[PDB]
Each structure stands twice: as structure tokens, then as C-alpha cells.
């Protein structure tokens, strides 16, 4: 395959020390546990457990991930992550790292999100968070990062305080120019084609692709929009939308090896208009901006996806 | 008898927990095979262990092995078990494999590397930041040990190591160190001569966490005052003439009789009459730069004959000669 970098950020990491993004040689202090009492268990994670707790030594409440310790490698990489983000716009924040004396499992303590569950969304309301995405994704990336996991679960709000966080970092990733990354990241329905046709020389555009994948499904009330029903199929979802024809000129583009498994199940597709989606339902949502900002996201060649900074500069966000 | 004592800070932490937590003797060792280690060269040697860096062949990683002479079997038991529980606390020396030779069987402790400097001539270009600075990472391996229910016993200069490079500081050899019970009369043959508290020299058995606080202020007051070591015994009775020739002896009649300690006769003829010392008579022009009123007011609050009276590790952060580190 032809190789690839970032149109944006694409030496950040390469112009810092090795102690920036050398996360296997990080040194990770493990703290005490005895200060947080835990309270209720909020969620379970493929590989976690958050719960709602206390910190025992000033009344605050926080949030406790819980690791099950399946690799080693992967919790340093989302602990110096996290570290190298604390206190970036609209980034969760990394209070503490403890263990339990008694269980020694690994475990994070964020800061508290009083997160609204969610009907009675605006046009604004919809500009707004995405706006707020944005800051945190042009943030990570111009901070070497990609956080390879951009979907609604891993977004928090707090409608109230119109706070929003970007959660979990467990999938994030240092970019690295002309590195050849694991396609086995993102969840389902926002992989990205360069993901889905294994090609790994991707970059911080992916985070742009599940972006738009949420816009989409935000604007047109088809939750979630690309519905595949396994890697595959997810791949001739998008090629239902996007067309045969392009799918074609992005793999031969990077020379790209389509699995043959693709064969049977790929089709010929048409390109399809952004307008055909639009509904009574859903109208309230959309305008020209909205559909131009979502064409200039959902792109198969991952190199012609609008930026995190790009996108801000839209006229989609004029009203923010 | 004695008036009974416990500690002021993290009593119950092992009262607590299930016994899994704190008993070694219980406690299953995994001794993995050495084959993944080279030994390189000799560090130190220890009354019952020997101390090498070493490679792991595995990962081309440095590592530091300790080969314990398997004198006392529990003892291993204690400092595998309390090595595991304080495994990743800030400035612990950190355990990562447990092995014996095949031919040998004698057991080995690995961890991870740390590049020691020696400060044997780095002792004059230090600065009085620089002692505030590796005296709060030493508090913070004490407060985050003590939290969990450890007791070191055996804190001196020569069981920290420091890459100064890197301002790194591990607390290391946690042979000597044990889980705190409240009530528990503990062996007071522990710590290091010239850093024992005088709980130790009076053979007053209940002590705690608060012990490490007077080696600390042992090791505060060597090095303000460049007086190495500050307190001179030559004998364990010696050891306590020698503090109270600085604490002067009211103060440790008022000690020994609020716990009703029995003191030695061994004292008898030795102890004399000492007047308590004011902190500035240890001020010279060699060591001038690196005291001040707030040195030796901290100083004054680890060095006090009473183990309650101490600073506890928590209390001793908050006080302003740390004022100028982060
Ligand atoms: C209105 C903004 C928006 C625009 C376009 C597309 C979607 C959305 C959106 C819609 C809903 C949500 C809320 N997602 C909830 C995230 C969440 N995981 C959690 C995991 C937990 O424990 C493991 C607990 C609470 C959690 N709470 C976030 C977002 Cl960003
Ligand atoms: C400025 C730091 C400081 C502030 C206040 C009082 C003392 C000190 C201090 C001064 C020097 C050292 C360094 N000690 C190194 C100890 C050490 N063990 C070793 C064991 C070895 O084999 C078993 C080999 C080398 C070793 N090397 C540590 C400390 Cl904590």
C-alpha cells in the first residue's frame, strides 16, 4: 500500500522528548484507594467497571474506572494519555490513579459529570455540543493524540451546565508519522473505511469520520446511520450511501487489497444525495450548512475529510 | 507495666482488612525462573542479601536483583508480602518478579531499575531546595506506606536511593518493615543505630508509623547540619546518651513517665544531666546555606522523645519548609 500522513499535526510528536509519547517507559505511582469510598456502580465496559464515589478527604464526588487488567501495555498507554490531556478543553479529567491495597486492581478517578441521559434538542443545541467536540479533538490532536473511539457513549453532557466531556481514552493512540496501526479499534458503526478495508497507515482524520457518523444520526434521527452487522457489512453500508465508485478510487488511490470476503456481499452501489435522508421528523434539524459540513465529513479518502480545525471555520458553527 | 500507645494517623488500616491483606505467613510465593536474568556486577551487600543490576534477556531491560541469604523463612514471607502490597506506591521501589536459580533455589527478589547516584560528591553542590525537594518525596513514600498499614523501620540514607538526573527517589530494603496493629508490642531491635528512636533505646515495644518520622529527622538534621551521622552512639545505650546530650534529659524523664517506660540500668551510670539544646547551636559556616528558621522549626517537630508528639508523614507535607516545592 501507498503510505500516508496527517495534513495537520504531523510532527507534534516527532519534535518532543521520547518521555512524551514513550508511554511503556512511563512509571505509573499508584496511590491509595482508602480515600474514595465507592457509592453505585454507573456502567460496564468491555474491559471496566465505572462507579460514582467520594473522596473521603474533601466531600467530592468522582468517578472510579475500574480496570480489569487484560493488558498491562494498554493501561500505561491510556494512563500517560490521560496525564498528557488533564486539564485540555472538554477533556475528561484524570484526579488520580489508585489501587485497593487489598484487590491491587488498577484504577482511574476522574472527575465528577452529572451526565443527562436525552427529544427537545434545537438546531443550536446540535451546533453547540458538536462545536464542543471539536474543541476537544482539535485539542488531543494537536496534542499527537487520536482518540480512535469517537462515538455518543463516549461523549458526556451535563445539559444543564452545557458541559460536555470526551470519555475514554482506553483506545487512544499517539500519532506517529508513516506508522502502520491495529485496524481492530473504534466500535462498529463508526469505523472508519480505512479501518474496515485494513489499511494502517491512518491518522486523526479517522476521530473526523466518527464525528460525522454522529452528526449524521443527530440531524437525520437514524441512530445509528451506517448500521452494519459485522466489519464487513459495515464497509457495504457505507458503500449504500456513498457508492461502489468511490470505494473503488479510494482502495486503488493506497493500493489497497480488498479482502475477498468483500466479494459476495459489496454490490454496485450509486453515490446517494444527503437530501434523500431529510424527513418530517428530522427537518427541524437540517439545513444546507448542516448537509455540506456532513459531506465534508463523511469522505472515504480519509485525507480529504475536513480537520478538527477546518470544521470549526464552517458556516455550520457561524452561529456559535 | 507500660501505658499502652497506638498510632495517631492510619490506626486501623490492617484491623480492617481481611487477613489475606496482612498475613504473610499465609501468603502463597510464585518463585519464577531466574534463566531470565543476567547477572552484571555487584552493588552492595546487605547482612543477609547481596544486590546486583542485572539484565532481563527478555526485554534487553536493566533490572536489580536482590539474592537473599534464606536465613529466616517468615522473614522473606514479610517482605515479599508488603513489597506486593506497596507494588507501584509513589517512591516504593517497585517489585516486579520473584525467582530462584534452578540450581541454587535460593530466593531472589527483581525490580525495577533505579540509576543510584553517588552523592559522596555530590553532598557540597547540594542546595537547601534540593533537601526540601527529596525530603518531600521521601514524606510521600512514608505517608502512602503508612496508609497502608506499613511500618519501615529501617529509613537512613542508605535505603534511598536517588537518580538525581532525573529527580527520581525510591524507598528501598523493606526486610525490616512491618504491618502496624494497634496494641501490637513489636522486636525493637530494628532500624539502624544511629537512626533509632528512642522508643527502641528504652525498649518501649508499642510503637508505630512515628518511628520512621524520628529516622527521617535523623537524616534531616545529617544533612542541614552536615553532621554525619547527627546522633554518634557507639552502643544502643550510647545511642541515647548521644540524643539526649542534644534533647537534653527533662524531656526524656518526661517521656519514660508518661508511658511508665523502666529505663535500663545499663543507664545508670552513663545517662548524666544534660540541658536541652537550642536547634541554632548546630549552625556553622559549612552548613549555613542550607538551615533556616523554617528547617529548623520542622526539624524540632520530627526530633521530640515522645513518638505521639511527632509529626505524622501527612502533617509534616503540610509544613512551610515545603512551601517552595510542588
Ligand atoms: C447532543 C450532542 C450530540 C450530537 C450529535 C450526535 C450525538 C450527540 C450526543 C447525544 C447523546 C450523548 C450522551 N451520551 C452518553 C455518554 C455516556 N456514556 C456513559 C458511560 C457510563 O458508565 C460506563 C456512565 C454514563 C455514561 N454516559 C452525547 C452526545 Cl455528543
Ligand atoms: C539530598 C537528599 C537527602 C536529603 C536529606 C537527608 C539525606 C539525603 C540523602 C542523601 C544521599 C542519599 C543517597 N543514598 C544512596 C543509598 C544507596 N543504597 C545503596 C545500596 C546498594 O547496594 C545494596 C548500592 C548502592 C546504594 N546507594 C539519599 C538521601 Cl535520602
Not at 268 to 283: A, D, L, M, P, T
Request: proline content about 4%.
Amino acid at each position: 500500500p501507498v503510505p500516508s500522513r496527517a495534513r495537520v499535526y504531523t510532527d507534534v510528536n516527532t519534535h518532543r522528548p521520547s518521555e512524551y509519547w514513550d508511554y511503556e517507559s512511563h512509571v505509573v505511582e499508584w496511590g491509595n484507594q482508602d480515600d474514595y469510598q465507592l457509592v453505585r456502580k454507573l456502567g460496564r465496559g468491555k474491559y471496566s467497571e465505572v462507579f460514582e464515589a467520594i473522596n473521603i478527604t474533601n466531600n467530592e464526588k468522582v468517578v472510579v474506572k475500574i480496570l480489569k487488567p487484560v493488558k498491562k501495555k494498554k493501561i500505561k498507554r491510556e494512563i500517560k494519555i490521560l496525564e498528557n490531556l488533564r486539564g485540555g478543553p472538554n477533556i475528561i479529567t484524570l484526579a488520580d490513579i489508585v489501587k485497593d491495597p487489598v484487590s491491587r486492581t488498577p484504577a482511574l478517578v476522574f472527575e465528577h459529570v452529572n451526565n443527562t441521559d436525552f427529544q427537545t434538542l434545537t438546531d443550536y443545541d446540535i451546533r453547540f455540543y458538536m462545536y464542543e467536540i471539536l474543541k476537544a479533538l482539535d485539542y488531543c490532536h494537536s496534542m499527537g493524540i487520536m482518540h480512535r473511539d469517537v462515538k455518543p457513549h463516549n461523549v458526556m453532557i451535563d445539559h444543564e451546565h452545557r458541559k460536555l466531556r470526551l470519555i475514554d481514552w482506553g483506545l487512544a493512540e499517539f500519532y506517529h508519522p508513516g506508522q502502520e496501526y491495529n485496524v481492530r479499534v473504534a466500535s462498529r458503526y463508526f469505523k472508519g473505511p480505512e479501518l474496515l478495508v485494513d489499511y494502517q497507515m491512518y491518522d486523526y482524520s479517522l476521530d473526523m469520520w466518527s464525528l460525522g457518523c454522529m452528526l449524521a444520526s443527530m440531524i437525520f434521527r437514524k441512530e445509528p446511520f451506517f448500521h452494519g452487522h459485522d466489519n464487513y457489512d459495515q464497509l457495504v453500508r457505507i458503500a449504500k450511501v456513498l457508492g461502489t465508485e468511490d470505494l473503488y478510487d479510494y482502495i486503488d488511490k493506497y493500493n489497497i487489497e480488498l479482502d475477498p470476503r468483500f466479494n459476495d456481499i459489496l454490490g454496485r452501489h450509486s453515490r446517494k444525495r444527503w437530501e434523500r435522508f431529510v424527513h418530517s421528523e428530522n427537518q427541524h434539524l437540517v439545513s444546507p450548512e448542516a448537509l455540506d459540513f456532513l459531506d465534508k465529513l463523511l469522505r472515504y479518502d480519509h485525507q480529504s475529510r475536513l480537520t478538527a480545525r477546518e470544521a470549526m471555520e464552517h458556516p455550520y458553527f457561524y452561529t456559535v
